[PDB]
Design a protein around this ligand. Structure first.
Ligand SMILES: COC(=N)c1nc2ccc3ncnc(Nc4ccc(OC)cc4F)c3c2s1
Length: 329
């Protein structure tokens, strides 16, 4: 399936957007909504993804009927159907993901004024899930999309792309979990995974706040501050960047394998040791300016990466953070 010219459910004519673990997202003309263009997510016919897609449709029926005008900027689902035993989800058509924009921008960062608007809308959208006893669990730049990704290009003492409109929506509700629903041990894409998740101390709304903080650094720098595919390495990077893990979380965790007594079981002089030393350093040292508005973002990021998820700032508090004052003038 998934070639252009193909028609899905005698309605959606494929014209073009993105592969992934789940399957494919294609652009389609809706021949039965005045030729409106739509995005259609074709999901692998694989138990893990079938489950997740059935679950995403459930969550999207709720979010879309709770918020029919999309004030809280969750992507609108139009319809869903089966095509050769594949689940297909039809959504409003957005622009590039923030990940795909950054990449197409030569992995250059967003300017600060754009990060402020985007940060605000992310916190607003996700806080809305948090109000409805939902946790996203998988926030990341790939899953934040521009409503519209049109740009202007211009040189800079390196060629640069700036968004005309930085408005975003949030997508992928396939991992989203209700407060009372069963809570998987593994959640999030490693680089955006909260410490309560790695340590299997149980997680909720706060694991989204950690993810967002990670997203905000990535937008600021153009790269992740956790460039890793290993759990222990991840905890070690957190240490050099955020300070020691709390006493209590280390001694609660059944994830004892990561520990030698009460210290992280970490060789400084081994290959990965040397990597963490060189590539990681105290968070505030990644600042590109000492400007107040830079200091203000960084104060918010630091709160979002509070180790203890109880102490971790909530998105309700995050929206009243100073960094957003400029938006209220
Ligand atoms: C792109 O136009 C859209 N309306 C989309 N609507 C949805 C709805 C659900 C989606 N659920 C998961 N992913 C989506 N996109 C996606 C984002 C970044 C990627 O690589 C960097 C790959 C992707 F496929 C989705 C998209 S993309």
């Amino acid at each position: 399936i998934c070639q252009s010219g193909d028609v899905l459910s005698a309605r959606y004519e494929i014209v073009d957007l993105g592969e992934g673990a789940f399957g494919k997202v294609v652009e389609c003309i809706d021949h039965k909504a005045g030729g409106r263009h739509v995005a259609v997510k074709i999901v692998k016919n694989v138990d893990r993804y079938c489950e997740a897609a059935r679950s995403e449709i459930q969550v999207l029926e709720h979010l879309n009927t709770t918020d029919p005008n999309s004030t809280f900027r969750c992507v609108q689902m139009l319809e869903w159907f089966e095509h050769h035993g594949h689940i297909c989800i039809v959504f409003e058509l957005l622009g590039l993901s923030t990940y795909d924009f950054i990449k197409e921008n030569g992995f250059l960062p967003f300017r600060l004024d754009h990060i402020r608007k985007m940060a605000y809308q992310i916190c607003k959208s996700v806080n809305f899930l948090h109000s409805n006893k939902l946790t996203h669990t998988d926030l990341k730049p790939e899953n934040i999309l521009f409503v519209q990704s049109d740009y202007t290009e211009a040189y800079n003492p390196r060629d640069e792309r700036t968004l005309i409109n930085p408005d975003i929506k949030v997508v992928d509700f396939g991992s989203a979990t209700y407060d009372d629903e069963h809570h998987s041990t593994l959640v999030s894409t490693r680089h955006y995974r909260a410490p309560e998740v790695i340590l299997a101390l149980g997680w909720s709304q706060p694991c989204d706040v950690w993810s967002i903080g990670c997203i905000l650094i990535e937008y600021y720098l153009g790269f992740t501050v956790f460039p890793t595919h290993d759990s222990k390495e991840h905890l070690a990077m957190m240490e050099r960047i955020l300070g020691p893990l709390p006493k209590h979380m280390i001694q609660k965790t059944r994830k004892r394998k990561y520990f030698h007594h009460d210290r992280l079981d970490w060789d400084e002089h081994s290959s990965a040791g040397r990597y963490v030393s060189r590539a990681c350093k105290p968070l505030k040292e990644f600042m590109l300016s000492q400007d107040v508005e830079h200091e203000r973002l960084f104060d918010l990021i630091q709160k979002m990466l509070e180790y203890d998820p109880a102490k971790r700032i909530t998105l309700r508090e995050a929206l009243k953070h100073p960094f957003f004052d400029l938006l209220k003038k």
